[PDB]
């Protein structure tokens, strides 16, 4: 069959090798950059 | 005093023997290794100095940290020192063991050997010409000659 | 454009002029484009910059000595595509790649003008708008733009304690802390109470609300004096702007009571105007006869 | 034109010389405070200043391809002299 | 849902491969202290090493245990084999780090962190 | 003594150089290759400029590839003088060392005075190279390969009809050819072993189809034949300098599209579009167009290549640095089978291994 | 122009090759040497 | 410079120094800038 | 176009048999080796007497960071920070604001001397070439923090050295 | 407080302490862990050296840039205290000789020179002085060591009336003279005792104990004045000391009684050289002292410092003296000494 | 066009693209995408289950004939859900060319080692494991070739970040060597240099 059924959260964060300081207490922003109004493009 | 004019020609006998003789251990690591054998190459020649190569550690003086120090060899460069006998010298040849070099900012690098072990002569470059590194060694020569081990302790 | 240059000549040397203490100008930088014309006239509604003269001598200026100061005159420095009006206080001082534009929102108006602080090395540098189509198009107010500098003059860094002689001087926290809470402990009722500022957000708001209520105090006050007569603030619809900032696009009468909205929250009356403008709305006015 | 602040220390060019409770002058116990003593501000002040006949100057620096960009310097400001925006050199409309 | 595995069906030949992993490093644990001339005990060593075990004690998938399974025999392989130094079996045991702030008011004394 | 296996740990000069790469622009992140292989710098950096310009769809005017194919065989000159008199150095002979350094200090003063910097130059960049050849540098390149061909005919004499030599490289790790293009050889690792493959022949770059020049061949596999074809190859290189001095084309330096190129300095300050042109491009930099090159040149340890991956800014998505010496030191595993220590270090002679690139 | 170029009638010509002079006797010559050497020892 | 002599300025050393490592004149870094952040400073009068 | 080094059949014959068991018991390639290196004794050795005399290099060296000045007193430096742009170690640190005459003038120009790489597009990149990086090699220092200069350091080293980087950037600056 | 010495960072290499410390006699064993323990919060410390620089290059790899002042100071002279320490906001003072030269009795090492740091510190403007002396101190004791100590002990904090005067009972580590002095009379004959080495008592106590109370003191405002009493939490006799440290170092052991009529005279028997003495008679006198309890004072208890017994870092000490046959052995070889 | 534009290859482009069609229509089970860039060089988008099937027919084929591994390469795009873009290049020394076969894979799925194909892979896909996390099964000795040993992480993903997260410095304390959290004495002052005018308007990504 060669394929396991895996329904559980997808979660690498014992991979990454991020110390937990950095994971639980940082507050990552997802964003648009807005235009710089300097210019036009 | 008497004494003390004795001390002082002791002094200076073993300062110029020490000065007069260094003894630097085989030790390169990146580009300045190719330059440390250019001031061992015939044109500057470090051995018109008494400066002789020796590759042991246990029978070297002065160890020219030539290259970049990565994390992967901060340990094995501070047993080589360990396993040098005082008195011992360092010498910090080029940028990245001076003080991280172009790859301060990087993950697996040791951003200068003075983290590990104690540097006497700081010579800058990326590398140093073999004039410029010989221009250390011969600092290094001018900072031994200024030492003034018997005659502290004669005052100590 | 090209990668080289078939001039050979003498250019020209368009002189400076002195329009404030904000926008530093330098006109021989100028490309004659005129957006100083028609933010000036448009928008901020000024009616103070012109061209004079007549070909290559056409010079974007005043022909007065006269100071451009509305309220809106910094946003000049944003449109002008080059680099003949400068900020003054930003002058010199900073380089764009190296800002760190952090997203940020203003705090000198009730307006919220959404703002990006951009910075270099842990220090604010300037303080630019957000191009946001509901609040603050994409201009700011001249106090929201050059109020940076008062942010780093006079202020408070370390706790500060009376001492014997009845003088404040620098302590640690956990005696500053110790002392608070000595006095807090003994309170209860209405022997302790609060006054609320104009800058401070709705986290510590709560945050003493809460601290507050462990001693069962609700004696908290604001400096803005609110009429609490009638529904108060119970329901909502009796201390905002219930339609929207937008919602003036939408309108055509508008009655403005008692108020100087020009400097009480400039983008608002600059979307006053952009309905006087481009919707012909008729504005009344009972209160003092303002500009 | 180098002045000496109150508690014994060289003031340099740009302003900066430290507090008397400020411990960052321990680096300099036992040293000396390398500061320059050719200070720009007052060496630009002993340049008289050039007058030129023509209405639009083009200042360069000198040595021409050894100095700044080649600008162009209006001078019919005749209260204030034309300044050159890079080498601090300035010019003056002689009418 | 449907991906390809690494070494194991299910969670229960991954707890088997977790558990062979934990006997190599019970085994382990007296060597490494004895041939790389320590100044732990073996009671220490082998309570760091249930604290390592216990650190990833919160994953379900299968295949995130398997590559942790993996690593841990890399971390054994470069033990048994003298390739870690006295310095990189020690870099576990954090010793010359200053004992952080756990609590919210000694964070609020030192700094800006949450 | 018998070698049952030879693990050749690595990365202890492994300084993160294509993360580095990702975050500075590609001017920026030219010195970078000076510094992988640091005996065959100006090689790297025109594998690297290779690369940025067939990514940026331009070409080098005629005068600056004569001379970074000029300055690539003095760099093959250099890199074959260090493996040789390293190669002999790690077995014992010590002389030829001290005898050949003393040319290879005359082309690193050929390298200060094109350059300034005596190892890492900083000179061909993307777009042909930076500064023109200074007056006077060709009379003494010149003067220099009137000299150098008696370096290597008493080298030859030295070293190549010894027998204590012989004894040491005859039988040393005999390489067969299909598992030489099994394991990723090239350069002097294949025609070594009886491959005939050179990248200026083959895949030709840029003046390298006009130049005439011979390919050593070997017979053997072994240690002795790739001695004897980076001999030759100093031989050949010296002819390729013959052939270059004999033929170098007047004109410009730099590409002449100045959107790549900065402007002289001369008409920088008196230009506006070179004024504005050199602060974008000493600020920003130039944009490259999006996609992904694999440029692979013959640098004189093999085929050293750059992988980049632009995503169409100013600065390099990846950037994948293929060594010579990586290859050739997996390659060490099966050569050094059946042999003892004394050989290991011949082999790793014969390998020419500069572990800056073999780590990044 | 000024610049650095080849001068009016190129370069010499440049020697590539190898130069190994062939010195030294021939085979007979050195053992005719070595054993009358062998045999004025021995009286 | 006996035949070619260099050219003169105002503001080049008439005293070329060698390397002043080690001695007293041996160069100490610092920051060159001055405060960012003015601090408040209190009223030294009673507050009564 | 390709040749092959090592491929030489020897010949077979009882002359060169005879001459080829000669060289193997007679040790005519010894002789010959130690002739070369006896050859080399004689010669006049390569050995500058450093620090008498000094190795030869060129007007475009690369050496020691400086501030230069235009012949009037006033420095170079208009604050424009092109230099710690282009940088690729990112050793400059440029803080900047109007003086007391209102020009464009820097009040924090460092040039970490243990990030930088000598490399020389500060002097490349500088538009009014302030920033040179002038001929001084023997700048070595007892103490790692002597190798962070300061806007002070390079002031005094462009004043020190500016009787030197003027002839230099004179006889280099037609290639630029 | 000033803008400079706020503490900022989260207390690594780089970070700001708070801290500028000027640490007297820091070239010695002490000084050595102060230093290291102060140079990874980012301290600017201050060491004043007397003898050579190369003496003092150990020191160097302790902090980042500029963080570590070198310079020269006489002990007789009051301008190079004076120069040294105006800066500063607390001095350690960690100078002690175990034994007297020909320029320095004990005298000069711990009434004069801890006199003149103390006295040019309060006349200086410095917040916090911090004075070490020995827990036996005492002003009628046999010995010179603890005579004088205890008269500069009482001349420090008379003087300065907020000198944090700490205790440590006897130090043991690595560069010691301690169990470096007990280790190494292996081959000079057999361990001589005073019968048997049975009738005194000690309690050692570890360096990092005490280097983190050093530092628990600078940080604590509540540690002014004290007078800090640091020991460790076993007590022992000195004959199963010995035990212990021959039965670590799996070392041969036969001692003897040597007594009072010529045990004090094999100082002048082996200090005939005027070299650094293997051993002296206040060597003698104080290993043969007995640790004297003060329950009264406060300790490393009262300062937030779990206290690290003997046996857990006794072979990280003593592993540097065994031969070659156990150097492969453990920590769980040795069976515990017995307290007291 | 005559001085500095590059010179077009027709003839390459051409046989590239025939080249890229045979491999296309002899492989339709594992190949995605056949593309050709414009300076030439050819690319086998394919699946990562085609890992040794495709590779095994351009070692073996009598018209492929790529013997040499030049090049294997990962590249991590952070964007896609399949995030890895594993690269191999490949040299034919009798068709004189050079061949690129580019698969994907995400953190946990494995890709099947090519040793068996090429043994100079042998350190190649390690590591990609090393520098990516790329787990590559049957592999003989699977593990870190470039980090130190007691490296947490993979270097070369993009959320890890430039400076690691531990910095090595000598501590008399210990006597040892050890690893701290890092504090950077000057930060990495990241440049935000990316002009926002369209630099090339031929590969413009068509709106939403
Ligand atoms: C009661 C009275 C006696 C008191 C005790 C005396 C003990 C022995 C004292 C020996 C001499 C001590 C002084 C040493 C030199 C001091 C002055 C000095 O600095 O001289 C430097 C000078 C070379 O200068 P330098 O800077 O090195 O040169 C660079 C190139 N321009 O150096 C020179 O020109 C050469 C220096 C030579 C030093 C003397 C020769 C060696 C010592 C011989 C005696 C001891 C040997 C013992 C047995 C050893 C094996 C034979
Ligand atoms: N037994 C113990 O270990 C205990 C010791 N203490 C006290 O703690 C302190 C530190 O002890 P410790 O580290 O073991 O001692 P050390 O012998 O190891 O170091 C003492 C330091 O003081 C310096 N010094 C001493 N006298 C002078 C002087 N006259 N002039 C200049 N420098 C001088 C020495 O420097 P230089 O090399 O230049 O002479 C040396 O660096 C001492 O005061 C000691 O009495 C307290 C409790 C227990
Ligand atoms: S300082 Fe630079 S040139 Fe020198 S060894 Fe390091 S990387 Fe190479
Ligand atoms: S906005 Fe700028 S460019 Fe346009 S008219 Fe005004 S000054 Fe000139
Ligand atoms: S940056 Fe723009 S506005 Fe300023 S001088 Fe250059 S082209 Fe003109
Ligand atoms: S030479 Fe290069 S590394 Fe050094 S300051 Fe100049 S641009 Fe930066
Ligand atoms: S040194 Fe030159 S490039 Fe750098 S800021 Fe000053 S003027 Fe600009
Ligand atoms: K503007
Ligand atoms: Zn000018």
Same mark, same amino acid.
């Given at each position: 069959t060669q394929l396991i059924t895996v329904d559980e959260k997808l979660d690498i964060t014992t991979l990454?090798?991020?110390?937990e300081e950095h994971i639980k207490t940082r507050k990552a922003r997802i964003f648009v950059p807005a235009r710089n109004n300097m210019q036009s493009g | 005093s008497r004494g003390e004019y004795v001390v002082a020609k002791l002094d200076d006998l073993i300062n110029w023997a020490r000065r007069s003789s260094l003894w630097p251990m085989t030790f390169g690591l990146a580009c300045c290794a190719v330059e440390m054998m250019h001031m061992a190459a015939?044109?500057?020649?470090?051995?018109?100095?008494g400066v002789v190569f020796r590759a042991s550690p246990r029978q070297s003086?002065?160890?020219?940290?030539?290259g970049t120090l990565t994390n992967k060899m901060a340990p094995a460069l501070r047993k080589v020192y360990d396993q040098m006998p005082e008195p011992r010298y360092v010498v910090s040849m080029g940028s990245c063991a001076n003080?991280?070099?172009?790859?301060?900012?990087?993950?697996?690098?040791?951003?200068?050997?003075d983290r590990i072990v104690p540097v006497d002569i700081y010579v800058p470059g990326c590398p140093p010409t073999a004039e410029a590194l010989l221009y250390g060694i011969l600092q290094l020569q001018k900072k031994i000659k200024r030492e003034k081990r018997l005659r502290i302790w004669y005052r100590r | 454009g090209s990668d080289r240059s078939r001039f050979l000549e003498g250019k020209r040397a368009v002189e400076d002029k002195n329009i404030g203490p904000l926008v530093k100008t330098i006109?021989?930088?100028?490309?004659?484009?005129?957006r100083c014309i028609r933010f000036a006239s448009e928008?901020?509604?000024? @009616?103070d910059l012109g061209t004079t003269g007549r070909?290559? @001598?056409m010079q974007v200026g005043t022909?007065?000595?006269?100071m451009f100061m509305?309220?809106?005159?910094?946003?000049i420095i944003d449109i002008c595509?080059?680099?003949?009006?400068?900020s003054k206080p930003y002058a010199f001082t900073a380089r764009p790649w190296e800002t760190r534009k952090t997203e940020s929102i203003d705090?000198? @108006?009730?307006?919220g003008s959404n703002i990006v602080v951009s910075t270099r090395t842990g220090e604010v540098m300037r303080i630019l708008p957000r191009?946001?189509? @509901?609040?603050?198009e994409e201009w700011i107010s001249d106090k929201t733009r050059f109020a940076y500098d008062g942010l780093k003059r006079q202020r408070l860094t370390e706790p500060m304690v009376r001492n014997e002689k009845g003088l404040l001087t620098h302590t640690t926290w956990e005696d500053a802390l110790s002392r608070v809470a000595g006095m807090l402990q003994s309170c209860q009722g209405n022997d302790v109470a609060a006054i609320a500022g104009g800058l401070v957000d709705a986290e510590a708001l709560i945050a003493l609300k809460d601290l507050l209520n462990r001693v069962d105090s609700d004696t908290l006050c604001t400096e803005e004096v609110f009429?609490?007569?009638?529904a108060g603030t119970d329901?909502?619809?009796?201390?905002?702007?219930?339609?929207?900032?937008?919602?003036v696009e939408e309108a055509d009468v508008v009655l403005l009571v008692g108020?100087?909205?020009?400097?009480?929250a400039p983008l608002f009356n600059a979307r006053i105007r952009k309905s006087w403008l481009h919707n012909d709305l008729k504005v009344a006015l009972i209160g003092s006869p303002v500009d | 034109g180098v002045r000496t602040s109150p508690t014994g220390e060289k003031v340099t060019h740009t302003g900066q010389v430290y507090d008397?409770?400020?411990?960052?002058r321990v680096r300099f116990v036992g040293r000396?405070?390398?500061?320059?003593?050719?200070f720009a501000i007052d060496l630009i002040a002993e340049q008289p200043v050039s007058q030129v006949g023509s209405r639009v100057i083009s200042c360069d620096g000198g040595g021409g391809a050894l100095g700044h960009p080649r600008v162009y310097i209006n001078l019919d400001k005749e209260t204030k002299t034309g300044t050159?925006?890079?080498?601090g050199l300035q010019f003056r409309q002689q009418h | 849902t449907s991906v390809k595995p690494?070494?194991?069906?299910?969670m229960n030949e991954a707890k088997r491969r977790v558990r062979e992993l934990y006997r190599a490093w019970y085994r382990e644990v007296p060597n490494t202290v004895h041939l790389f001339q320590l100044d732990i005990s073996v009671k220490q060593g082998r309570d760091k090493v249930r604290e390592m075990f216990k650190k990833?004690?919160?994953?379900?998938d299968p295949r995130v245990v398997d590559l942790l399974v993996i690593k841990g025999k890399m971390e054994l392989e470069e033990t048994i084999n003298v390739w870690k130094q006295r310095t990189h079996v020690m870099?576990?045991?954090?010793?010359?780090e200053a004992p952080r702030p756990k609590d919210f008011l000694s964070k609020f004394y030192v700094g800006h962190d949450p | 003594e018998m070698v049952r296996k030879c693990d050749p740990h690595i990365?202890?000069?492994?300084?993160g150089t294509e993360k580095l790469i990702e975050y500075k622009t590609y001017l920026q992140a030219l010195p970078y290759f000076d510094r992988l292989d640091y005996v065959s710098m100006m090689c790297n950096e025109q594998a690297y400029s290779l690369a940025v310009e067939k990514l940026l769809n331009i070409q080098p005017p005629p005068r600056a590839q004569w001379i970074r194919v000029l300055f690539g065989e003095i760099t093959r000159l250099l890199n074959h003088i260090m493996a040789v008199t390293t190669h002999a150095l790690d077995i014992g002979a010590m002389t030829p060392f001290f005898w050949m350094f003393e040319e290879r200090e005359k082309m690193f003063e050929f390298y200060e005075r094109v350059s300034?910097?005596?190892?890492?130059?900083?000179?061909?960049?993307?777009?042909?190279?930076?500064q023109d050849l200074p007056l006077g540098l060709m009379d003494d390149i010149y003067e220099f390969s009137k000299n150098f061909s008696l370096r290597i005919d008493e080298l030859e004499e030295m070293l190549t009809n010894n027998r204590i030599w012989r004894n040491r490289t005859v039988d040393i790790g005999v390489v067969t050819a299909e598992d030489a293009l099994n394991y990723g050889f090239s350069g002097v690792m294949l025609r070594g072993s009886g491959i005939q493959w050179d990248l200026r022949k083959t895949?030709?770059?840029?003046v390298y189809d006009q130049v005439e020049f011979d390919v050593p061949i070997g017979s053997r596999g072994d240690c002795y034949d790739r001695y004897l074809c980076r001999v030759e190859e100093m031989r050949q290189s010296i002819r390729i300098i013959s052939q270059c001095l004999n033929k170098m084309p007047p004109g410009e330096?730099?590409?002449?599209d100045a959107k790549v190129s900065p402007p002289k300095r001369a008409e920088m300050k008196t230009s506006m579009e070179s004024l504005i042109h050199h602060f974008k491009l000493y600020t920003e930099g130039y944009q490259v167009p999006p996609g992904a090159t694999y440029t692979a040149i013959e640098a004189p340890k093999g085929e050293f290549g750059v992988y980049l991956v632009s995503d169409?800014?100013?600065?390099?998505?990846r950037c994948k640095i293929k060594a010579p010496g990586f290859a050739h030191l997996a390659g060490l595993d099966k050569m050094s089978?059946?042999?003892?220590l004394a050989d290991v270090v011949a082999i790793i002679g014969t390998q020419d291994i500069v572990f800056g690139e073999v780590d990044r | 122009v000024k610049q650095d170029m080849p001068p009016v009638g190129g370069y010499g010509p440049i020697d590539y090759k190898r130069n190994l002079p062939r010195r030294g006797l021939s085979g007979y010559s050195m053992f005719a040497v070595g054993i009358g050497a062998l045999l004025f020892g021995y009286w | 410079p006996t035949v070619k002599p260099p050219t003169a300025r105002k503001?080049?050393?008439t005293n070329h120094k060698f390397n002043?490592?080690?001695?007293?004149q041996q160069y100490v870094p610092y920051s060159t800038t001055r405060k960012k952040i003015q601090e408040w400073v209190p009223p030294s009068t009673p507050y009564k | 176009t390709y040749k092959y080094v090592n491929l030489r059949e020897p010949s077979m014959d009882m002359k060169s048999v005879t001459d080829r068991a000669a060289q193997t018991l007679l040790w005519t390639e010894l002789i010959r080796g130690l002739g070369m290196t006896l050859s080399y004794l004689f010669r006049e050795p390569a050995?500058?007497?450093?620090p008498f005399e000094k190795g030869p290099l060129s007007p475009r060296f690369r050496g020691e960071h400086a501030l230069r000045r235009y012949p009037?007193?006033?420095?170079?430096?208009?604050?424009?920070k092109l230099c710690e742009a282009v940088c690729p170690a990112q050793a400059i640190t440029i803080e900047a604001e109007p003086r007391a005459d209102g020009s464009?003038?820097?009040?924090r120009y460092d040039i970490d001397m243990t990030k930088?790489?000598?490399?020389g597009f500060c002097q490349e990149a500088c538009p009014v070439d302030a920033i040179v990086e002038g001929?001084?090699?023997?700048?070595?220092?007892?103490?790692?923090?002597?190798?962070?200069?300061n806007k002070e350091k390079l002031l005094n080293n462009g004043d020190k050295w500016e009787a030197e980087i003027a002839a230099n950037i004179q006889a280099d600056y037609l290639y630029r | 407080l000033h803008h400079a010495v706020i503490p900022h960072g989260?207390?690594?290499?780089?970070?700001?302490?708070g801290i500028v410390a000027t640490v007297f006699?820091?070239?010695?064993f002490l000084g050595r862990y102060l230093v290291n323990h102060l140079g990874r919060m980012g301290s600017q410390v201050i060491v004043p050296y007397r003898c050579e620089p190369y003496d003092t290059?150990?020191?160097?790899?302790?902090?980042?840039?500029?963080?570590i002042i070198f310079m020269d100071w006489n002990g007789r002279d009051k301008d190079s205290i004076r120069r040294a320490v105006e800066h500063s906001n607390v001095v350690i003072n960690l100078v002690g000789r175990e034994w007297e030269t020909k320029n320095f009795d004990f005298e000069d090492v711990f009434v004069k020179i801890p006199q003149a740091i103390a006295q040019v510190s309060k006349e200086a403007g410095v917040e916090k002085f911090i004075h070490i002396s020995h827990?036996?101190?005492?002003?009628?004791?046999?010995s010179k060591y603890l005579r004088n100590k205890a008269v500069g002990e009482k001349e420090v904090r008379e003087t300065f009336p907020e000198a944090t005067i700490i205790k440590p009972a006897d130090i043991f580590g690595r560069?010691?003279?301690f169990l470096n002095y007990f280790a190494n009379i292996?081959?000079?004959?057999?361990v001589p005792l005073i019968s048997?080495?049975?009738?005194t008592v000690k309690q050692p106590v570890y360096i990092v104990d005490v280097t983190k109370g050093i530092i628990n003191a600078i940080k604590?405002?509540?540690?002014?004045?004290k007078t800090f009493a640091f020991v460790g939490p076993n007590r022992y006799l000195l004959f199963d000391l010995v035990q212990y440290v021959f039965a670590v170092a799996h070392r041969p052991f036969l001692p003897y009684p040597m007594p009072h009529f010529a045990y004090r005279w094999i100082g002048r028997l082996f200090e005939?050289?005027?070299?650094?003495?293997?051993?002296?008679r206040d060597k003698v006198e104080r290993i043969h002292t007995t640790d004297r309890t003060l329950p009264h004072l406060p300790g490393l208890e009262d300062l937030g410092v779990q206290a690290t017994p003997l046996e857990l870092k006794a072979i990280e000490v003593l592993?540097?003296?065994?031969?070659?046959?156990?150097?492969?052995?453990?920590?769980?070889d040795v069976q515990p000494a017995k307290t007291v | 066009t005559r001085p500095t534009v590059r010179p077009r290859n027709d003839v390459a482009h051409k046989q590239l693209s025939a080249f890229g069609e045979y491999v296309a229509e002899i492989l339709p089970?594992?190949?995605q995408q056949v593309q050709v860039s414009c300076f030439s060089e050819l690319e086998i988008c394919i699946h990562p289950d085609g890992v040794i099937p495709v590779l095994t027919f351009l070692r073996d084929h009598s018209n492929a004939?790529?013997?040499?591994?030049?090049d294997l390469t990962a590249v991590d795009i952070?964007?896609?859900?399949?995030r890895f873009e594993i690269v191999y290049n490949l040299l034919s020394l009798r068709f004189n060319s050079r061949i690129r076969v580019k698969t994907y894979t995400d953190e946990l799925t494995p890709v099947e080692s090519s040793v068996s194909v090429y043994k100079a892979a042998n350190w190649y896909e390690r590591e990609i494991w090393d520098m990516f996390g790329v787990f590559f099964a049957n592999?003989?000795?699977?593990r870190r070739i470039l980090?130190?040993?007691?490296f947490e992480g993979h270097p070369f993903?993009?959320?890890?970040?430039?400076?690691?997260?531990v910095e090595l410095r000598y501590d008399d304390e210990v006597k040892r060597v050890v690893a701290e959290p890092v504090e950077l004495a000057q930060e990495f002052r990241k440049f935000?240099?990316?002009?926002?005018?369209?630099?090339?308007?031929?590969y413009r990504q068509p709106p939403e």
């Open positions: 990454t090798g991020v110390p | 015939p044109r500057y020649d470090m051995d018109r100095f003086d002065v160890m020219i940290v030539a003080g991280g070099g172009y790859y301060h900012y990087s993950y697996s690098v040791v951003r200068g050997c | 006109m021989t930088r100028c490309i004659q484009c005129t928008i901020a509604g000024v @009616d070909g290559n @001598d022909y007065i000595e006269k509305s309220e809106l005159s910094g946003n595509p080059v680099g003949a009006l400068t705090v000198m @108006d009730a307006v191009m946001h189509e @509901d609040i603050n009429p609490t007569a009638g329901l909502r619809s009796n201390y905002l702007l219930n339609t929207t900032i937008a919602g108020t100087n909205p020009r400097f009480e | 008397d409770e400020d411990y960052r000396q405070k390398e500061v320059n003593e050719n050159c925006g890079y080498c | 690494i070494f194991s069906r299910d990833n004690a919160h994953v379900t870099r576990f045991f954090h010793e010359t | 990365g202890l000069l492994h300084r300034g910097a005596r190892m890492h130059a900083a000179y061909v960049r993307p777009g042909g190279v930076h895949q030709p770059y840029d330096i730099k590409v002449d169409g800014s100013s600065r390099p998505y089978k059946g042999h003892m | - | 503001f080049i050393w002043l490592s080690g001695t007293p | 050995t500058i007497n450093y009037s007193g006033e420095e170079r430096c208009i604050a424009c464009r003038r820097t009040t930088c790489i000598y490399c001929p001084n090699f023997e700048f070595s220092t007892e103490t790692h923090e002597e190798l962070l200069y | 989260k207390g690594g290499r780089s970070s700001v302490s006699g820091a070239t010695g290059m150990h020191l160097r790899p302790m902090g980042d840039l500029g963080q827990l036996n101190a005492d002003i009628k004791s046999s560069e010691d003279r292996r081959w000079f004959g057999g048997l080495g049975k009738k604590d405002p509540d540690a002014r004045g005939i050289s005027p070299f650094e003495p293997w051993t002296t592993r540097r003296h065994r031969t070659y046959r156990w150097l492969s052995s453990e920590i769980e | 089970k594992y190949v004939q790529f013997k040499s591994l030049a952070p964007t896609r859900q399949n592999h003989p000795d699977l980090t130190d040993y007691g993903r993009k959320d890890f970040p430039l400076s690691g997260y935000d240099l990316n002009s926002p005018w369209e630099a090339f308007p031929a």
